[PDB]
Structure formats: C-alpha cells, structure tokens
A paper describes a structure:
Mitochondrial ribosomes (mitoribosomes) synthesize proteins encoded within the mitochondrial genome that are assembled into oxidative phosphorylation complexes. Biogenesis of the mitoribosome requires trans-acting assembly factors that chaperone rRNA folding and guide mito r-protein incorporation. Here we used cryo-electron microscopy to determine nine structures of native yeast and human mitoribosomal small subunit assembly intermediates, illuminating the mechanistic basis for how GTPases are used to control early steps of decoding centre formation, how initial rRNA folding and processing events are mediated, and how mitoribosomal proteins have active roles during assembly. Furthermore, this series of intermediates from two species with divergent mitoribosomal architecture uncovers both conserved principles and species-specific adaptations that govern the maturation of mitoribosomal small subunits in eukaryotes.
Consistent with this idea, this backpack module and h45 are flexible and unresolved in state 1, whereas in state 2, these elements have been docked onto the particle. Docking of the backpack module and 3′ rRNA stabilization results in platform compaction and rRNA ordering similar to that observed in humans. Given the unique way in which yeast mito r-proteins mS42 and mS43 stabilize the 15S rRNA 3′ end from state 2 onwards, it appears that these mito r-proteins have functionally replaced human assembly factors ERAL1 and RBFA. In states 1 and 2, the pentatricopeptide repeat protein Ccm1 localizes to the 5′ precursor of the 15S rRNA in a position that is subsequently occupied by mS47 both in state 3 and in the mature yeast mtSSU. Ccm1 uses structure and sequence-specific RNA recognition, binding to a single-stranded region of the precursor and specifically recognizing bases −6 to −1. Ccm1 is therefore in the unique position to chaperone mitochondrial pre-rRNA in a co-transcriptional manner similarly to eukaryotic ribosome assembly factors binding to other 5′ precursor elements. The exchange of Ccm1 for mS47 is coupled to the irreversible removal of precursor rRNA that is accompanied by conformational changes of the mito r-proteins uS5m and mS26m, and additional ordering of a flexible linker of mS45 in state 3 that is previously absent in state 2.
Author numbering:
A (entry chain 2): 30 to 128
B (entry chain D): 2 to 76, 88 to 205, 372 to 486
C (entry chain L): 78 to 149
D (entry chain V): 2 to 159
E (entry chain P): 2 to 106, 110 to 120
F (entry chain 6): 27 to 222, 291 to 345
Write the structure that this text describes.
RNA sequence: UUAAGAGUUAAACCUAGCCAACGAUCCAUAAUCGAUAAUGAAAGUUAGAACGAUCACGUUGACUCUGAAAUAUAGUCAAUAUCUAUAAGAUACAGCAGUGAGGAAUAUUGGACAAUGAUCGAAAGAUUGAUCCAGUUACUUAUUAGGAUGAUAUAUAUAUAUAUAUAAAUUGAUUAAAAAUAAAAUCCAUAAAUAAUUAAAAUAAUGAUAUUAAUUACCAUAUAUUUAUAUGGAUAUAUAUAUAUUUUAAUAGUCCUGACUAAUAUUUGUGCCAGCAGUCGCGGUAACACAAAGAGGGCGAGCGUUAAUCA
C-alpha cells in the first residue's frame, strides 16, 4: 500500500533528488506521482526505459521508505586515487617521479 | 526420428505397425521370412531388417541399440523367451496407444501425443518416448480415436459425385421395380433365401447436376433425400467432425484388430490401463509381432553384438 | 601413379599419393597429408586430401564427392 | 564405473564422516579391559621382552589411550554461566539464547553418541552369545546320533 | 559470514536447474569443493500445483533432506550457518528467532508440525 | 548366397501379359488389385473377405496360407469367388477343404507366421459391472474376485478404475452416439471372456509466503549429491525423466 | 638447531660398512589417482580432457622478514624480456575477455552481482571476470523435424458385387522389371506467428537470464467432477442479439552394392589407360570392382575418412 508523503520528502521529485546516483533523470518517467512510484514493480520500470541498476536501486529505496529506514544516497565504491591494488605500485611510482 | 519414407513399398514387402491397406497386402502376401541358403550374418541381417521394420521403425538404429535390453522377462509347451526381444518398446506411450487401438499406426499415435490429445493419469503428456509403468492409466481424446478408427471423411465434391451415382442407381432400381414387379420380387426373395402397392410406394428421385450445386452445402443437404440417406451428403451428416460422420469402421480393420494381453481398454471413454510389461509364458508371448520365434532369435543375436 | 614428395610441418619428408582423376599439385604447393598407403607403390604410405590447401577437389566428380573434395 | 560395483554402484564420494568422540569413552568397559589386559608376550604378541633393552631415547610402551569422560568433556567444553543474574540488554538476550541452544545441542549430541556406542557393544554381546548357544545346540544334536554306540570300531571313525 | 567452519549451500545440478547440498565447509575452500560433511540436500524450485489443487488450497512444497542430529552437533561446536542456511534451519525449528535479522523480521496460517 | 528378392506373393496369381506401352504397371500392383477386388464408386472393396468387420464375436484374421491367396467373397452370400480367364469373378471349381477345417486356435491367431501371438478375450460389460459391485460395494478384495472369475489382480484393479471412469463420463453425458457405436462394434470383433518411519517437519507458513518447506530426516553419509559422480550428459546413457507437470527433465 | 626423530643441515670423534642380475647407479620419459571416462564376458588394458581428491608451479635461480605454517604470485639480489617516469623505477595475463606465433585443431576484448559463496564494515551497505547467465562452435548427447487417405478423367440411364462407353496414361521394360503409394489430389492436425495472460528460480525487498517457461485461443464466475450447461463484460452483423468469434505450415544429407559385407532391373563410357583398393584383388571390348545412368542397401543431422584406445 502507498505510504503517505512526508514533509522531509514531499514529492517524487525530492525522493529522486535524495536517493541520488543520477536518479534525477527519471523524473519524467514517473511524472511526479507517488502512487505510480509506490506500485511500479521491476517489469514496468523495465518497459518504461529504466536501466537495471537504476530500477533495482529505486525499488530498494522504495522498500526502505515503506519500512521507514533511511533513504539517503549510498555513494558507490570507487577505486583509490592511486589506482587499484594491483596497479597501485606502478601508478604510485609514476606519480612520485613525475611530481 | 526417422522420416517416414516408403513404409508401404510392395516390392520390399516389409510389415509395419499400421492399419494401411498396403500394409495389409504386404502382410498377406509375405508368407514367412526365408532364412534358407543364407549365412549366419545374412540370416541375422534379414531378421533384423524385418523385425525393425515392424518393431520401432521410427527409432534410429543407435537409439534402439541404446534402448535394447540384453535381458528378457518371463513368468507343457515351450516358452518363447526370445519373442521378448522388443518388449522394451511396448512400455512406450505411442506403442501403448497403437496396441490399445486408439491410433491407426505408431506414427499416428506419436502425432496424437505430440499434439496434446493424450493424457497419462490425468496429466497431459506431449512426449512419445514417455514410458508407462504398471497400473498407469492413459486416455485419448475421443475425436482422435474416432478419426483413427473411423472411415475417411469425404470432401464435398467427391460425396456430391457419389450422391449423383446413388440417385441414378435408385432411379434405375425404381424403374425396374415399377415395370416388372414380378421378377423383382422373385429376385428379392431368392436373394433373401405379393402386393402391387409396393411398386407404387417406390418414388423416383430428381437427378442432380453438380455444376450449379457446387459451393453450397446446405442446398445439397436439403435437395438430396434417399430412403437410407435423408437430408445430408454422403458421409457428411454433420460436416464438423473429423471423420466419416455416420460412424462406420475404417476399411480393413478386422485383420489388425488384436486385443492386447497387457492393456485393459475401455472404448466408450477411450481409456486404457497398462497392466504390466509384456511377458512370455508357455506357448504364448504377449509381444504382438507378425514374425515367428526364429526371426526374433536372429534379431536378438544381431543386437547382442551390435551386428558384429 | 601420381604421387608427390611432401615436407611436413614437423620436418619429416614423406611420399604421398594423390587420388582422383586429375590434380593441380605443383612444387611449393601447400597440401594436407593423411595416413593410408598406396598398396602397389612401395614407399608411399600417405595420401593427400583433395579440396584442402592448394590442392583442389576432383573436377566433375559425381559419386563419393566428399572423398574427393567436390562441392555440389 | 567398474570400481563403483564395490561401493553399491554409487558414483561419487561423500567426505568421510567425522567421529563426535575422537577417543573412546570411559564407559566402554570392554575397550578398557582390552587395553588393560596383559600384553601377549613374545613375537606373536606386541611388546618388548623382559630381558631385551629398547633404544636409549625411545619409549618401551606406546602412549596410553586417553579415555574421554563424557561428563568432564561436557563440563570443560560447555560450562553453564556462574552469573545467572543480569539486567536487560538488547543483544545480551540474543547471545544468551544462542549460547543456551548451542550448549543444549552439544550436550545432547555427546550423550547420545555415548549411548549409541554402548548399544552397539550390547548388540555384539547378544550376537556372540547367541552363536555360542548355537554351538551348544549342535552339541545336543550330536549326542543323539552317538547315543547309538555299540562300541565296535567303524571306518568313518577311523 | 564468520568462523572457519560454516554451514552453507554448495551448488549441484545443471544450468538453469539449481539444486544444493547443505554442507559444513571450511571458509577458505571453494564453494563446490568436497566439504567436511554433507548435511543434506535442498531443492529451491517449489513443487508444481495444479489449478484444481489450487482450488483445494494446497501450497507448493520446497523439499529439504537434512541430518538433524548431526546439524545440531555442528551448531553446538561453533559452526556458523549462512543467511539462507540460517533461514532453512529456522523454518525446521533447529534455530529459533535469536538467529533472525531486522530485515527479515506476519500472521501464522500454518504452524510447524512434526510427524513421522 | 543372398540377393534382393522382390516380395512377390507366395501363392499363384495372374502375372502381367503383353502390356500396352503406356500402362506402366507392375506385377505387384496387379497382385494387390486381385487381392483387393473391384473398387466401388464409393471407394469400397466389397468383394474382399476382410473389408467389413465381423459381428459374430469371432475375429476375421488373414489366412493367406489356408485360402491360397483367394480373398474375394460375395458380400452377401459370403461364398468364394475366384477370378476367371474371362475376367469375371465366379464360383471356384473345387472348394478348399482347409477353410472349412480350421482349428479353433488359428481363428484367434492374428498373424499366419507367428502361432504364439493370440488375441485376448474381451470382458463383457455385465461382468465388468459385477466386478465393480463386488469390489467397491461388497468390499471384496482383488484376490477373491481374481480367483472367482479366473482373472488376474492387475486386470481386476484396471477394470475397477475403468468402470469408475465410465460411470463419471456417463454422468457428464460425455459418451456420445459415435463413441457408443465404436465401442459396440469393437466389442463384437473379439472373443468374449467366459466367467466359468522417518521424522518429517512441515514448516511454519506465514501470510504472503508462496511455499511451505518440508524437511525429511536423513542419515549423514547417505544424504547429499556425491562429489565426483560420473557425468552422463554427453553420453548415450543420458538419464531422462518427466516432471510432475509432465515436462521432460534431465535426471 | 626445531615444537619434534633422524648424517636433514653445521661441528667433533669412532667403526667399515650400505645398495645391487628379484636389476643398484646412470640415462630417457612422465604430474598422480578415484565410487571419473573408454573398452572387454571378465582378469585386466588405455586416458588422467570433463566431475572430484593430492601435489607442484604463477617468467628463471638463491636467500631473508613476517608468521603457527612461505625459500610466499611478498621483499632483496641477480638472470631474461620489455616499457618510461631514467629511478637503491615498473611490468612479466599458466585470473577473465582478447591479440600474435605454433598447430590438423579448441570460442566473447559479453550481462549481472538476481541466486550460491568470499572480503570489509557495528550496521546501512560496498567490492567480487569466484559464481551465475548469455554469445560462438553439430565437439558430444537427447527430443522434435506431419499423420490418415490416395493409382486416372469425363458421358449415359431401405436399395445396395452398379454396368457400360470413350479418352488419356512420365522414366525403364514386355512380365515375376520395376521406379511407385512414390507423386498429385483429398481429410485432419499441430509448430511458428498474432493476441491476451503468466509462474518459478527469492523473497522483507532485490530477476542478469528475459522478446522467461507454461496455459487459452475472446474474458471472467458458478456448480459438477479435464469435460459440460448456465450468469455477466467482449463481438461485427443484420435487425439490446438468432448468429459466429486470429491464422496456420513442412523442411536431408553422406557412404556403398565381386567376396569378407547388407545391396539381381538392368545399361552406357573406358580399354592393364584413366583409375579403384582395409585384405583377396579389378581394369587388354563381355568391367557386378574404374567414371556414370537406372534400380537397390546402410547410417541419418549427420555420413565418410584419417589419427588413436579397448576387444
Ligand atoms: Mg563511502
Ligand atoms: Mg560481519
Ligand atoms: Mg551379399
Ligand atoms: Mg642427531
Ligand atoms: Mg644424506
Ligand atoms: Mg661431519
Ligand atoms: Mg635399472
Ligand atoms: Mg612433464
Ligand atoms: Mg607435470
Ligand atoms: Mg582432470
Ligand atoms: Mg599414465
Ligand atoms: Mg582445460
Ligand atoms: Mg611458489
Ligand atoms: Mg619460483
Ligand atoms: Mg607468461
Ligand atoms: Mg587469458
Ligand atoms: Mg597456423
Ligand atoms: Mg553477490
Ligand atoms: Mg563483469
Ligand atoms: Mg518408354
Ligand atoms: Mg570408389
Ligand atoms: Mg563395359
Ligand atoms: Mg567393392
Ligand atoms: Mg562403379
Ligand atoms: Mg542413381
Ligand atoms: Mg543426434
């Protein structure tokens, strides 16, 4: 069933803004309808055009909202500035000598 | 499986698991399998050829070799042990259908299974290679069995021509009866071995020309009315069933009408129960086959060693 | 009998019989050699494969085309 | 495929099942008696003779079998907490429940394993005793045949 | 999870048709390597239910074969079961709600029943 | 010695003479036409012995050896009719004594070459209904009825199942006129039989759960899929079975 | 010295021993094995790809720290080979794809962490070429790859063996010489499509596979036990309602026919040539063996052949 929009996240626009990971580009897909966002399963989000990662993340955060768990942006893991562990040594050697 | 090719060739004279008229003639004229003046390899090859032409022809040779079981089962006369060479094929669903007289041939049984017309214990089975166990109940859609055992449904044109001929012959008989009722009554009683109103009761029938009547079935249905054939075209009493509608058995059905010993059949419902695997007992083998024991012996010797 | 000496990729030099009614094998030609001796030729223990390498299949072959590389 | 005929025609292998009790228990009287029994003396036996010396650094006798005591193993391996009284903790209740279940499971497993071993020992005793009374039965049967002794000398007896 | 000894699922079967062995395994061995023991089998595909059986009200059944005495022993000595294995054991009654998780956890339509 | 032997009839038949060049016929086709007899405008072969099914509860099986290939009778009088030099069918000179003197066993033998093959007797509907009453209503065991009627237990159980199914079909009016005709006809074509523990846990089910776990007790060392077991997927001994739905699954 | 025995290593002092024609030492070769694969009646024999167990290695050799355990895919040193950053630098794809070479010959520079595992984190969660899926490839194995009927066209006039005419009739052949029920034609189906719906792999939620499998040919419900008749939403029609209610197929190669070794219906070209051949062997007008036609016999999405293994 539909959760009721909260003052913290009044609209699906604000929801996509908060969850992040470039989910803001999906605003037109949902047309700012709470009911559509909270009844649309994975097959529908696929036929709309949402990619696999985006629809999985959106369904995860929608379930979190149903269960009132925090829906803040989870920044994805990134390789270190000095490169991956396997490439860390060569990249560090290059960076040190160059600068 | 193998593609059906020259299964009824009169020259080759092979007997097939089928109710064909040509298969009937091949079985009739065969006599027996000639094994005289042949080396052991030639005898084995002839026996293999004939028995595999009858038993499981549609199976590929390698598949049959894999399916071949070098053992035999049995339960005063001598028990024909080696007629059980092909008993393993008898538990297959298509073979069971054929032996239950629910299909005209094993190929037609395969098509019936593949098209979803067959059930085994209430669940639809679409695989002819399905193997039945003792006590298994299988059933066929009644229309398919009626089509397999019933005569072919004529087309509109052919039945219209047959009706033309029937009307013509009825008019001829009516003329003969009216002109000379004496001799007609005498002939009728002789064939069985007076009142003049009888010849008055007979009525001519309007001749029909098919050129104007083609393409309209209800017109012909209403126009054609013979004392046996009232208000329908020949063989098309209700042209929506897949068989000769006034249901009569297919021609040449009695030669192949064999009741199995391992299946129990209810033809009202088109159901059957697989009682057991066929077995050999003193003086009898439950594996229906048109070849005598030596032929099966030689085939078994062939398939024990793979034709070595 | 049409045959040819062939040096194989492993260094061995053998004599290979050339089957078929006609052949276009010539020196420097790339061929494929399989086993099977020519019975009436002593020392020729190998055959050349028609329709493989630089050796074409038999021209105008109707029967046993697969054994001679012919296509139809 | 051939070797599977030895193992019941089962293809593939399971890992060898582990023994819950690594060493024999102290309630297995027969094993202790065999261990404690006088070792067979001499070469058909297993031990050094009285007069012969062993190598300087070696041990004359093998290490003695450590007979597990199930009560001691349970007490040392899984000991009930001394401090029964405690206050409310969100994870403490869960940890206590898990610890209680694990203790119960291990205690139950050990005790049932010991009972199982003793039951097999009793079963073997019954088997052997029944076989010995079967020998007594043929003793009864033979005397019937040889109650017919005319005390003349026969060839089958020769 | 944690610990050297872990009760987990090793995948057997064929592509698109998974079956599993519930096994006690060393944490550092491969998933399908030979384990310390094979405690059981698990078939994740529910039993098919006919439409008429749906009218009857029968529910699809997922089949697990398990050694209950030995699994309890391995839980006692400190074996750590995986999440899916933890769920499987909980439904069997080997483990209680103490092994649950916040995400996992409602009305009971059928209660766990033990019959020979 | 072995050679291709065209399967000509073993019995005497009228071989082709000089042929008009465009006939393009064969002796085999002429033998088939002689065996079949004249064809009707309706397509039938009334002259043939076996064209029409029997109705006297005695099967009509081919007897090419006894009748020496003469398989044409008058459809009504059922007297033999042989081909004649004029081309017409007519009475034979001497009637075959073999066809009057036919052993009772041979009449139930479908195929002339195989004596061991024989047709099975068909149980009468009254006997089937009596068996149904004896088993289901009177509570008799399959053993007692099997001994009583000289029947076998699997056949008795199959008869019970079939009579129950027939009762259901008659309840739903599924049996039709054509089916009744087909059953009746095939009934008269055959001879008629003459009477004289493991602990199991069913798991807790919660609303929204689509399945219920079933746990069976098993013994370690015997439960599990073995490691290193032989793979027969690419071998002729590949193991195939059928699902509960009826689909094909590799085992 | 080790946690630990021992010429295992290092030192010292004694004895003269130790192995070996039932094969030492040396050389060549080789990863080993199974409840794995092949084969055989079996003993055995072969393989060690695939599933599984053990070992060894991560370009080569030695040593060192840490550690319970490493001569570690670590570090140091050197050897080889490359790249730049020219430094008491980095890298070595026997990790996944992929490229070049070698070879008769062995694929995607793919999708996802949905499932099962693994690492980190208290958790939220993050990573995962392990893994799971898909792609290529008849490399192998299995199911399908359509059944029944069917030897001719017209014209004549409660019975029923309908009979007469004419016309045609492909290849071979003049009757046991066939191709051939093979074709055509007819009857009845289903696959595919087109529509709806729709599981399961997974649940608290998350599905890459996915244009999912499966079901029905309008859709539900309402009773009976899959087939029925009903009630209601579809449906064009004609004139709410009598009616019907998507469409629909067919698609085989390859070898051989003297004997071993299954293949009789016969002909043509060549002429010890061209050629065939596993063995015997055939080919000089009369070729069952060469190259073909007809017919025929095997296996069949495979067939043959070469290389091997067992018997
Ligand atoms: Mg972060
Ligand atoms: Mg953790
Ligand atoms: Mg021959
Ligand atoms: Mg020392
Ligand atoms: Mg030494
Ligand atoms: Mg020294
Ligand atoms: Mg030596
Ligand atoms: Mg090596
Ligand atoms: Mg090696
Ligand atoms: Mg391997
Ligand atoms: Mg070896
Ligand atoms: Mg490999
Ligand atoms: Mg190393
Ligand atoms: Mg190294
Ligand atoms: Mg390298
Ligand atoms: Mg690579
Ligand atoms: Mg190359
Ligand atoms: Mg993952
Ligand atoms: Mg990836
Ligand atoms: Mg001609
Ligand atoms: Mg040739
Ligand atoms: Mg010639
Ligand atoms: Mg030859
Ligand atoms: Mg030739
Ligand atoms: Mg030809
Ligand atoms: Mg295949």
């Amino acid at each position: 069933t539909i959760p009721k929009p909260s003052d913290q996240v009044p609209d699906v626009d604000a929801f996509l803004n908060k969850i992040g990971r470039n989910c803001n580009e999906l605003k037109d897909t949902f047309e700012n309808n709470w009911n559509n966002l909270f009844q649309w399963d994975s097959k529908i989000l696929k036929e709309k055009g949402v990619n696999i990662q985006q629809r999985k993340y959106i369904l995860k955060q929608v379930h979190n909202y149903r269960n009132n768990r925090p829906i803040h942006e989870i920044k994805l893991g990134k390789k270190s500035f000095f490169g991956g562990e396997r490439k860390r040594k060569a990249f560090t050697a290059k960076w040190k000598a160059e600068n | 499986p193998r593609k059906a090719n020259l299964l009824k060739s009169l020259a080759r004279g092979r007997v097939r698991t089928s109710f064909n008229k040509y298969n009937l003639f091949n079985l009739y004229k065969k006599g027996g399998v000639d094994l005289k003046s042949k080396s052991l390899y030639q005898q084995k090859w002839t026996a293999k050829q004939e028995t595999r032409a009858y038993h499981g022809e549609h199976l590929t040779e390698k598949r049959w070799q894999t399916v071949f079981k070098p053992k035999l089962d049995s339960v005063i006369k001598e028990t024909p042990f080696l007629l059980q060479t092909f008993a393993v094929l008898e538990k297959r669903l298509d073979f069971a259908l054929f032996r239950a007289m629910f299909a005209s041939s094993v190929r037609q049984a395969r098509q019936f299974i593949l098209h979803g017309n067959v059930r085994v214990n209430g669940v639809k089975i679409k695989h002819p290679s399905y193997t039945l166990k003792p006590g298994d109940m299988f059933s066929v859609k009644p229309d398919k069995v009626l089509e397999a055992l019933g005569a072919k449904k004529p087309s509109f044109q052919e039945a219209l021509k047959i009706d033309k001929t029937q009307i013509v012959l009825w008019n001829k008989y009516v003329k003969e009866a009216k002109t000379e009722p004496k001799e007609v009554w005498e002939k009728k009683l002789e064939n069985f071995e007076f009142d003049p109103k009888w010849a008055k009761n007979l009525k001519y029938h309007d001749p029909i020309k098919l050129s104007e009547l083609e393409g309209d079935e209800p017109k012909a249905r209403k126009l054609i009315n013979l004392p046996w054939q009232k208000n329908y075209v020949y063989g098309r009493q209700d042209p929506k069933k897949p068989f000769f509608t006034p249901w009569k058995p297919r021609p040449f059905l009695s030669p192949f009408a064999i009741l199995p010993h391992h299946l129990e059949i209810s033809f009202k419902t088109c159901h059957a129960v697989y009682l057991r695997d066929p077995v050999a007992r003193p003086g009898q083998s439950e594996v229906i086959s048109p070849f005598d024991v030596p032929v099966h012996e030689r085939a078994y010797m062939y398939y024990l060693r793979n034709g070595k | 009998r049409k045959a040819c000496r062939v040096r194989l990729t492993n260094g061995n030099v053998v004599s290979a019989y050339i089957p078929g009614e006609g052949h276009d094998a010539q020196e420097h030609s790339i061929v494929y050699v399989r086993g099977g001796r020519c019975q009436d030729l002593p020392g020729v223990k190998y055959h050349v494969i028609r329709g493989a390498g630089d050796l074409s299949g038999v021209v105008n072959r109707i029967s046993s085309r697969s054994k001679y590389g012919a296509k139809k | 495929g051939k070797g599977a005929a030895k193992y019941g025609f089962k293809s593939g292998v399971f890992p060898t099942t582990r023994s819950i009790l690594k060493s024999p228990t102290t309630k297995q009287t027969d094993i202790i008696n065999k261990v404690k029994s006088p070792k067979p003396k001499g070469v058909l036996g297993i031990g050094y003779a009285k007069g012969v010396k062993h190598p300087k650094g070696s041990h004359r006798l093998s290490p003695k079998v450590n007979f597990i005591d199930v009560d001691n193993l349970i007490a040392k391996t899984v000991a009930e907490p001394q401090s029964i009284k405690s206050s409310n903790g969100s994870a403490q209740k869960v940890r206590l429940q898990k610890a209680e279940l694990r203790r119960k499971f291990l205690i139950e497993a050990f005790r049932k394993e010991e009972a199982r071993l003793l039951h097999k020992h009793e079963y073997l005793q019954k088997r052997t005793k029944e076989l010995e009374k079967a020998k007594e039965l043929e003793l009864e049967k033979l005397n019937k045949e040889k109650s017919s002794d005319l005390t003349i000398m026969t060839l089958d007896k020769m | 999870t944690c610990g050297l000894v872990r009760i987990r699922l090793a995948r057997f079967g064929r592509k698109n048709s998974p079956v599993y062995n519930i096994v006690v395994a060393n944490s550092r061995k491969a998933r399908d390597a030979k384990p310390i023991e094979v405690l059981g089998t698990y078939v994740p595909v529910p039993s098919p239910v006919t439409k008429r059986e749906l009218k009857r009200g029968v529910v699809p059944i997922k089949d697990v074969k398990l050694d209950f005495d030995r699994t309890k022993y391995w839980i006692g000595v400190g074996a750590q079961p995986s999440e899916t294995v933890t769920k499987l054991l909980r439904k069997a009654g080997i483990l209680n709600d103490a092994w649950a998780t916040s995400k996992n956890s409602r009305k009971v339509v059928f209660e766990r029943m033990e019959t020979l | 010695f072995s050679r291709r032997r065209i399967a000509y009839p073993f019995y005497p038949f009228k071989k082709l003479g000089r042929q008009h060049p465009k006939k393009h016929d064969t002796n085999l086709k002429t033998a088939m036409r002689q065996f079949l007899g004249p064809k009707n405008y309706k397509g039938e072969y009334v002259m043939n012995k076996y064209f029409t099914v029997p109705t006297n509860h005695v099967p009509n099986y081919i007897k090419p050896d006894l009748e020496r290939g003469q398989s044409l009778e008058h459809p009504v009088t059922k007297k033999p009719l042989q081909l004649r030099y004029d081309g017409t069918l007519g009475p034979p000179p001497v009637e075959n004594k073999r066809l009057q003197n036919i052993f009772k066993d041979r009449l139930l033998q479908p195929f002339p070459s195989n004596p061991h093959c024989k047709t099975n007797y068909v149980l009468s509907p009254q006997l089937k209904q009596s068996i149904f009453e004896e088993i289901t209503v009177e509570g008799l065991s399959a053993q007692q009825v099997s001994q009583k009627y000289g029947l076998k237990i699997p056949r008795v159980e199959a008869i019970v199942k079939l009579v129950s199914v027939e009762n259901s079909w008659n309840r739903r009016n599924r049996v039709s006129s054509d089916l009744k005709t087909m059953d009746e006809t095939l009934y008269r074509m055959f001879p008629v039989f003459d009477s004289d523990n493991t602990k199991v846990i069913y798991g807790e089910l919660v609303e929204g759960e689509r399945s219920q776990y079933k746990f069976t007790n098993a013994k370690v060392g015997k439960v599990g899929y073995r490691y290193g077991s032989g793979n027969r997927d690419n071998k002729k001994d590949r193991r195939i079975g059928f699902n509960k739905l009826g689909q094909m699954v590799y085992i």
